[PDB]
Scaffold this active site. Structure first.
Site, PDB file in Angstrom:
ATOM      1  N   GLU D 204       0.826  -1.206   0.000  1.00 49.06           N
ATOM      2  CA  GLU D 204       0.000   0.000   0.000  1.00 49.06           C
ATOM      3  C   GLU D 204       0.862   1.259   0.000  1.00 49.06           C
ATOM      4  O   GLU D 204       0.614   2.204   0.744  1.00 49.06           O
ATOM      5  CB  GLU D 204      -0.969   0.006   1.184  1.00 49.06           C
ATOM      6  CG  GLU D 204      -2.106  -0.979   1.089  1.00 49.06           C
ATOM      7  CD  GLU D 204      -3.132  -0.610   0.034  1.00 49.06           C
ATOM      8  OE1 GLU D 204      -3.141   0.548  -0.424  1.00 49.06           O
ATOM      9  OE2 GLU D 204      -3.961  -1.474  -0.321  1.00 49.06           O
ATOM     10  N   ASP D 205       1.872   1.262  -0.862  1.00 51.16           N
ATOM     11  CA  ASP D 205       2.665   2.447  -1.198  1.00 51.16           C
ATOM     12  C   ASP D 205       3.815   2.708  -0.229  1.00 51.16           C
ATOM     13  O   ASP D 205       4.601   3.617  -0.441  1.00 51.16           O
ATOM     14  CB  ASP D 205       1.787   3.691  -1.313  1.00 51.16           C
ATOM     15  CG  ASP D 205       0.695   3.528  -2.347  1.00 51.16           C
ATOM     16  OD1 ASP D 205       0.977   2.955  -3.415  1.00 51.16           O
ATOM     17  OD2 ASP D 205      -0.440   3.970  -2.092  1.00 51.16           O
ATOM     18  N   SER D 206       3.961   1.891   0.791  1.00 53.11           N
ATOM     19  CA  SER D 206       5.129   1.950   1.651  1.00 53.11           C
ATOM     20  C   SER D 206       6.358   1.433   0.903  1.00 53.11           C
ATOM     21  O   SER D 206       6.248   0.777  -0.132  1.00 53.11           O
ATOM     22  CB  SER D 206       4.884   1.131   2.911  1.00 53.11           C
ATOM     23  OG  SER D 206       5.846   1.435   3.877  1.00 53.11           O
TER      24      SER D 206
END
Ligand SMILES: [Mg+2]
Ligand SMILES: [Zn+2]
Ligand SMILES: [Zn+2]
Ligand SMILES: [Zn+2]
Lengths: 49, 404, 51, 479, 49, 35, 115, 260, 46, 67
Positions: D204-206
RNA sequence: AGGGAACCCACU
């Protein structure tokens, strides 16, 4: 005398106009600094078109 | 504690959590709870409230803890499912030809919190003992629940032919007596839709068993993914030369068809359809031609993809992306629209000064005939920018209307 | 209808696949700055005395 | 038009529009008209010839400048209204004769189509390969990226300033970046990036970061804050004076120690400071007696070392001091990073070198981003940048990612990469660091220019348990 | 920025080469704050005499 | 005389470079204030 | 602000025990070995050596959390054997193999250096 | 039920790298040795800096970090030294540290380059690697006239697990099954993958036939040194250190078993 | 007691007394900088 | 600002290579040839040298505070 | 013992 006009940096009537990079560095100014802004009570101000 | 992300749109925007203390400076969240919060990890911040008395603590514990919130009364279905890595990986894990050795199995069982400590008999005993992904996943499933689903790539005519009960593609999911007998798991089986496996687990077992189900799927599958791996690269964005030639031929034919429609309208040989002025009829025919071209090129690109293609892996699992995304990366990007219409004549009878006046062809009015991999031409780039600006604006205004 | 409240905290969120869905990882400085008032009983007087 | 191109009576700035269908000619000399230069086409040929290029190549010596092009009537300024009447070629390839001519009456040609972009969008490589909202997002994030904002930063006492230890220029550049001085003052680091799922902490974009790289100065930066104060003698009754207050005379002294101050009431450069530490000692005489403490304290939750202390007089001649405090920031979990393609994320975890996946050479990724970002974002520019960056590092050159360049396509880059002994699509076989086993799937890996954004978790983290309250309503303070 | 008509926030055709099509804030001001394209120039005016 | 394509790319970036050598990037601000 | 000191990953805290042993009560002849301030290095080699033992029915290890410095090793043996015995014998075998490897590397280095 | 019997061959041995093959061992052991090379081979590095003067354009922490990253010859001293945390000394003694001093001032009109050559050690055998008697010296900072740098530093024993400055390697190449006979990776299109330097396939063959009974044997290493230790000494120190870890665990486990 | 400041222009050290206005005794410049502390500054080299 | 001491990715020392690299370039080596001559084989180390910007010279153009 | 208003930029 009728007043004072804030001067845009590196414009024709600024003390930095025309200085060489070496001259700018002697004044502790960055040669890459584009100018085009004012200094009002120490704060750099830019006019938005 | 009560945890919260703004805007607070529904019950599941504020849920109870148990605190665990960890070293660094962030709040740490399990991936599955991102969906109810509509949260991601690109700079989001969330709020924490600490109830201050045994009575408020008991209220939160008994009414609002995450596990009690698994099913929403908005739509009588789960609000949380399996997402992102776990979903893509579980789709790969449950394919028919996934075989695991003794050591790999023991490691995965290491990550199964509800395991009763008995190693099941391997599905293959000779020449070598091998377990399948389905056997391990069966160990993950709680109780003895029963559920039938279909994988996303399930062919429509399979259920009426022979092999209805022995799927050639392993596209029919059957969980019987808590055991995954057949089928590839995906969003349809582990997502938030009504009747999914997680829904049936919640309905048949409590919130507590189902909480463990979520956690165990994640831990076991992520650790298997350490072996399997998952990537996306340039190679997934390419197609074979035959596919490229087919796409180019389709585009060329569509362009010639639009030229024929224009030439017909210019000779007054075009008659309006009922309830439409002539210009609306011409625009309808042009948009029909270009939509058909976009669909045909998209289908050709989708057919070209191999089973190793990573775009396809994430689309078929339902983790991220759509078939349209694949079409736009591989085949054409397609028509750009402002306010539901082709690019308007913003100059005088021209969309840009690079065209002649009264040019109704695809290029002039914003049909992007290139893929993102090939790159857009300057005019296509600008028209695509106009199209994208439309969406940014929609976000930035709808918010206040809807809030009120 | 709304107010600012005591006993609250805010920071960036980051993923943790090794937490249960009902857990939240909290930094030590936040945990050290927020308190829960526990009532002293003979059951807990020793634990709270050490605290 | 002849007069304007000669610069005789009509200056270049003047706009002349003929509306043929109407019978109006409109001439504008106003201020405030936006215009752009274009090459003049006569018949079907550029008026710009080889000799003009020859004279410009030697502009250092002969002094032949852009103004001489405008004077020789080879380039023109065209404002929007006049552009309405122009027939514009995108490139000189449009003037070449064709089996069925499209126009054959061109009046102007673009100098280069990439000039449609502004300053921030001009640093994006391969922007013509991204979904447009992603170019828009980079256009903002690039203004948030840490670099070296100006060369004379040592002499500036700005309220806030961020400086990156080891800025690099990108391995993959656009030609318009030469004029933005991005080379001279870059705002990022070329990072070895792998697009992989690895333990789950970049979902999730981490992003996952290499702790051994961070130990070596990867994306380490320094944060500066300047505090200012002045002593005012406004009235003969009350006067403020810089001094080191003592608890016998001054009254409102916090429990912070004042021994870090010098006898002039000011802290000295090189002193370590923490939140709620006094840095400027100042007292105001009353109308524990006869003096009220009004000292300046370091902001709560912040820490650092005094960098420099400047003392002057302000406009009205009162003593005036500015204090710059520096704080080194090591990238950590929760800090925000972004490539140039709108792909932003916070660091989710850091692994040491031995825990990271590795290639058969010793190479581990500096950063691992998650493959689920790409499919729906469609930032194919990011992937092409990685491929070309791998080529450019191996070959020893800077790749050219100028947008609308026909000489560059993915197949050509791939063929070049194959020549250096790598899989032509940028994939490599990686080994799991924990076990040493190969990873079944091969991993897309290569150098990508990454930015450290100013948003750091340690400037955001906050908690409260019964602190100060507002005067009017008695509710907790804001902020 | 409080107005909710999309039309003045839209990317008009005539921005080509004058105003960057990409750089604009993504908040309430989307489409209302713009940035000059690289080679754009703004006239300072002159006498028509 | 004529610039050919293989020369065209270098030529166009030489023209653009000369432009920026003359004008800079904040010429509109400075020119307006000087006026 | 909340950064743990780097030494925290390999230095035992006061009172912390290097290794703890518990019985796994679900099945017979199974133990859990908790080891503090160790990571995949030791856990993986020990597990693989245990899997070489024909009297070991189950061997596996895990790091419960990457931000903590604990490993858990689970061992089940046949009833004629003990998980404690298997663990001890696995460490002895690993030490023997490493000693042999060091001797042979010394010999190979000497050969290469001489010629 | 018992231990492997590994064999070793050295294929290349220079001052900066050692290339070798281990056979008849398990993948877990091979990978653990690799991991120990990176993170658990002790080395000496600067970890304490007192700055008396710094007029350079770089702030104190910047200079200190760079000093920390300078590799120091550790080859025989490091085994003798104790960990500073274990030493009974109160601050720093020759049993747990090495003192360095630096004192440079630019008095001329040309830029003064402060290099690791200006780091003066108290121990003749622990010195910057570039100062060992071509390779230039490591630049620390550049000074113009009137600027000065004066500091005192101590180097102590540590390993890469604590901080990467104690990592002795400059890349550990590691590889097994060069021809993909175990199919531990699966190529979508095998023919477009270049051969490993350890491949023994013909130019027309892309990968070996699948081996259903195969196990990873024969691990290939190329350990490059950063200069602080000789490459072979890196390897030997890793083997000894991993053995020590196992022995300590054995002692603790013996106490624990006896205690119940 | 001394309170030495460095002139921003001529780089001359010069004594300043509290309540004394800021001015370089040599060149008359009005901007001065404090000298580095004498306190012990120690860094880990990390 | 100044050449990093180590390659971020692998830790190889590159801080003693910048002046040599500038020397080789002025001796008409191509960047690739110069990087080969200095022994920078992995593309991470090559990135370190290829992408460096030596801003410290610009900083040395300003007069120091103390004489 | 501790202010406030206004405006601007920015983040999800
Ligand atoms: Mg977000
Ligand atoms: Zn000692
Ligand atoms: Zn002076
Ligand atoms: Zn390297």
């Amino acid at each position: 005398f009728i007043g004072k006009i804030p001067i845009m940096l590196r414009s024709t009537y600024c003390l930095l106009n025309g200085l060489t990079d070496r001259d700018l560095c002697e004044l502790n100014e960055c040669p890459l600094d584009p100018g085009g802004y004012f200094i009002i009570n120490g704060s750099e101000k830019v006019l938005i078109a | 504690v009560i945890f919260n992300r703004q805007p607070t749109l529904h019950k599941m925007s504020m849920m109870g959590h148990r605190v665990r203390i960890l070293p660094w400076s962030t709040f740490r969240l399990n991936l599955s709870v991102t969906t109810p919060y509509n949260a991601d990890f690109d700079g989001d911040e969330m709020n924490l409230h600490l109830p201050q008395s045994l009575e408020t603590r008991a209220e939160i514990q008994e009414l609002a803890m995450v596990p009690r919130m698994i099913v929403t009364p908005q739509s009588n279905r789960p609000v949380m499912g399996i997402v992102q890595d776990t979903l893509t990986a579980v789709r790969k894990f449950t394919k028919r030809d996934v075989f695991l050795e003794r050591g790999e199995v023991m490691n995965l069982l290491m990550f199964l919190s509800t395991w009763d400590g008995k190693v099941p008999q391997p599905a293959i005993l000779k020449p070598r003992p091998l377990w399948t992904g389905k056997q391990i996943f069966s160990l993950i499933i709680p109780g003895h629940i029963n559920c039938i689903r279909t994988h996303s790539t399930h062919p429509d005519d399979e259920d009426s032919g022979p092999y209805k009960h022995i799927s050639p593609g392993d596209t029919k999911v059957v969980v019987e007596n808590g055991e995954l007998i057949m089928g590839i798991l995906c969003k349809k089986s582990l997502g938030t839709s009504a009747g999914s496996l997680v829904h049936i687990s919640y309905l048949e077992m409590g919130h507590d068993i189902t909480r463990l189900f979520y956690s165990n799927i994640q831990t076991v599958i992520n650790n298997w993914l350490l072996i399997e791996g998952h990537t996306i690269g340039i190679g997934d964005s390419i197609a074979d030369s035959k596919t490229y030639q087919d796409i180019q031929n389709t585009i060329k034919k569509a362009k010639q068809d639009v030229i024929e429609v224009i030439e017909k309208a210019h000779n007054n040989e075009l008659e309006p359809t009922p309830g439409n002025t002539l210009r609306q009829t011409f625009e309808n025919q042009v948009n029909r031609i270009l939509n058909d071209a976009r669909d045909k090129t998209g289908s050709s690109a989708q057919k070209s993809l191999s089973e190793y293609n990573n775009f396809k892996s994430m689309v078929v699992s339902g983790a991220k992306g759509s078939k349209i995304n694949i079409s736009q990366v591989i085949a054409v990007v397609g028509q750009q629209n402002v306010e539901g219409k082709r690019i308007p004549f913003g100059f005088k009878h021209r969309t840009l000064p690079h065209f002649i006046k009264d040019d109704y062809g695809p290029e002039s009015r914003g049909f992007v005939e290139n893929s993102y991999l090939a790159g857009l031409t300057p005019t296509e780039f600008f028209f695509h920018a106009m199209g994208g600006r439309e969406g940014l604006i929609d976000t930035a205004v709808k918010t206040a209307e809807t809030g009120y | 209808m709304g107010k600012r409240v005591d006993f609250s905290a805010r920071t960036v969120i980051t993923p943790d696949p090794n937490l249960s869905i009902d857990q939240v990882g909290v930094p030590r400085s936040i945990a050290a700055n927020m308190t829960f008032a526990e009532i002293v009983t003979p059951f807990n007087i020793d634990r709270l005395q050490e605290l | 038009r002849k007069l304007r191109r000669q610069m005789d009576i009509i200056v270049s700035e003047v706009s002349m529009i003929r509306d043929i269908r109407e019978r109006e000619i409109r001439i504008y000399t106003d201020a405030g008209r936006i215009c752009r230069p274009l090459l003049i086409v006569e018949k079907q040929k550029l008026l710009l010839k080889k000799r003009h290029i020859d004279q410009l190549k030697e502009r250092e010596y002969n002094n032949y400048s852009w103004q001489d092009l405008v004077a020789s009537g080879v380039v023109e300024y065209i404002d929007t209204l006049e552009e309405e009447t122009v027939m514009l070629a995108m490139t000189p390839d449009d003037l070449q004769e064709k089996e069925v001519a499209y126009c054959s009456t061109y009046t102007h040609c673009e100098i280069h189509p990439s000039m449609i972009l502004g300053v921030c969008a001009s640093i994006i490589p391969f922007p013509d390969h991204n979904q447009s909202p992603r170019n828009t997002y980079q256009s903002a994030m690039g203004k948030q990226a840490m670099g070296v904002y100006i060369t004379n930063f040592h002499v500036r006492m700005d309220t806030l300033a961020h400086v990156l230890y080891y800025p690099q220029k990108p391995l993959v550049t656009t030609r318009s970046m030469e004029y933005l001085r991005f080379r001279e003052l870059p705002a990022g680091i070329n990072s070895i990036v792998a697009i992989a799922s690895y333990t789950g902490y970049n979902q999730e974009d981490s992003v996952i970061m290499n702790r051994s790289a961070v130990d070596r100065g990867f994306f380490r930066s320094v944060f500066y804050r300047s505090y200012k104060e002045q002593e005012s003698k406004k009235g003969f009754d009350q006067e403020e004076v810089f001094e080191k207050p003592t608890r016998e005379t001054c009254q409102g002294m916090r429990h912070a120690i004042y021994d870090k101050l010098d006898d002039d009431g000011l802290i000295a450069p090189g002193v370590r400071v923490s939140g709620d530490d006094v840095i400027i000692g100042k007292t105001v005489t009353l109308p524990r007696y006869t003096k009220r403490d009004c000292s300046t304290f370091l902001r709560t939750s912040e820490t650092g070392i005094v960098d420099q202390v400047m003392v002057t007089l302000n406009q009205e001649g009162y003593k005036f001091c500015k204090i710059r405090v520096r704080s080194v920031r090591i990238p950590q979990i929760g800090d925000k990073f972004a490539s140039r393609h709108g792909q932003k994320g916070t660091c989710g975890i850091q692994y040491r070198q031995e825990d990271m996946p590795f290639t058969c050479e010793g190479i581990t990724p500096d950063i691992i981003i998650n493959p689920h970002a790409i499919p729906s974002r469609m930032t194919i520019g990011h992937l092409i940048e990685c491929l070309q960056g791998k080529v450019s590092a191996n070959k020893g050159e800077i790749g050219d990612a100028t947008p609308f360049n026909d000489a560059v396509n993915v197949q050509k880059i791939s063929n070049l990469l194959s020549d250096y002994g790598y899989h032509l699509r940028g994939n490599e076989v990686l080994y799991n660091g924990f076990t040493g086993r190969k990873i079944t799937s091969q991993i897309f890996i290569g150098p990508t220019y990454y930015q450290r954004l100013k948003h750091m978790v340690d400037d955001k983290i906050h908690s409260r348990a019964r602190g100060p309250i507002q005067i009017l309503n008695r509710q907790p303070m804001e902020g | 920025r409080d107005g909710k008509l999309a039309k003045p926030r839209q990317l008009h055709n005539t921005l080509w080469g004058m105003v960057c099509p990409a750089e604009t804030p993504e908040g309430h001001a989307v489409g209302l704050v713009k940035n000059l394209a690289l080679m754009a120039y703004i006239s300072v005016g002159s006498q028509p005499s | 005389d004529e610039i050919t394509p293989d020369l065209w790319q270098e030529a166009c970036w030489i023209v653009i470079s000369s432009y920026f050598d003359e004008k800079g990037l904040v010429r509109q601000q400075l020119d307006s204030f000087d006026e | 602000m909340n950064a743990p000191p780097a030494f925290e990953s390999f230095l035992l805290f006061e009172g912390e025990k290097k290794i703890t042993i518990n019985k796994d009560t679900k099945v017979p002849n199974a133990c859990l070995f908790t080891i503090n301030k160790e990571d995949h290095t030791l856990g993986n080699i020990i597990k693989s050596q245990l899997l070489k033992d024909p009297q070991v029915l189950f061997a596996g290890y895990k790091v419960p959390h990457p931000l903590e410095h604990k490993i858990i090793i689970r061992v089940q043996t046949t009833p004629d054997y003990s998980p404690q015995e298997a663990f001890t014998n696995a460490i002895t075998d690993l030490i023997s193999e490493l000693s042999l490897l060091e001797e042979r590397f010394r010999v190979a280095i000497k050969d290469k250096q001489e010629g | 039920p018992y231990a492997n019997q590994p064999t070793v061959r050295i294929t290349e041995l220079t001052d900066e790298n050692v290339k070798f093959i281990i056979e008849n061992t398990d993948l877990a052991v091979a990978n653990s040795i690799r991991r120990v090379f990176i993170a658990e081979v002790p080395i000496i590095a600067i970890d304490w800096v007192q700055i008396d003067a710094n007029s350079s354009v770089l702030h104190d922490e910047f200079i200190a970090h760079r000093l920390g990253l300078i590799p120091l010859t550790s080859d025989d001293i490091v085994d003798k030294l104790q960990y500073s945390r274990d030493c009974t000394c109160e601050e720093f003694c020759p049993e747990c540290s090495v003192e360095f001093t630096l004192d440079v001032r630019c008095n001329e009109d040309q830029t003064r380059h402060v290099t690791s050559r200006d780091l003066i050690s108290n121990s003749p055998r622990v010195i910057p690697v570039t100062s060992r008697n071509e390779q230039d010296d490591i630049l620390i900072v550049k000074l113009r006239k009137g600027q000065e740098l004066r500091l005192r530093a101590y180097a102590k024993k540590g390993f890469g697990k604590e901080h990467a400055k104690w990592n002795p390697t400059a890349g550990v190449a590691f590889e097994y099954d060069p021809d993909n006979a175990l199919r531990h990776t699966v190529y979508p299109k095998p023919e477009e993958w270049p051969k490993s330097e350890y491949s023994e396939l013909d130019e027309d063959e892309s990968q070996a036939p699948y081996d259903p009974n195969g196990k990873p044997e024969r691990f290939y290493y190329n350990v490059e040194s950063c200069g602080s230790l000789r490459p072979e000494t890196i390897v030997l120190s890793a083997l000894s250190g991993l053995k020590k870890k196992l022995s300590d665990l054995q002692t603790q486990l013996s106490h624990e078993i006896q205690s119940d | 007691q001394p309170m030495i400041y460095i002139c921003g222009e001529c780089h001359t050290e010069n004594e300043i007394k509290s309540r004394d206005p800021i001015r370089c005794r040599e060149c008359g410049y009005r901007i001065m900088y404090k000298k580095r502390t004498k306190r012990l500054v120690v860094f880990d080299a990390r | 600002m100044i050449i990093p001491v180590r390659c971020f990715t692998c830790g190889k020392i590159v801080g003693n290579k910048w002046e040599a690299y500038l020397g080789l370039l002025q001796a008409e080596y191509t960047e690739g040839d110069a990087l080969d001559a200095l022994g920078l084989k992995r593309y991470c180390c090559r990135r370190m040298l290829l992408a460096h910007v030596d801003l410290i010279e610009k900083l040395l153009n300003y007069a120091p505070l103390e004489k």
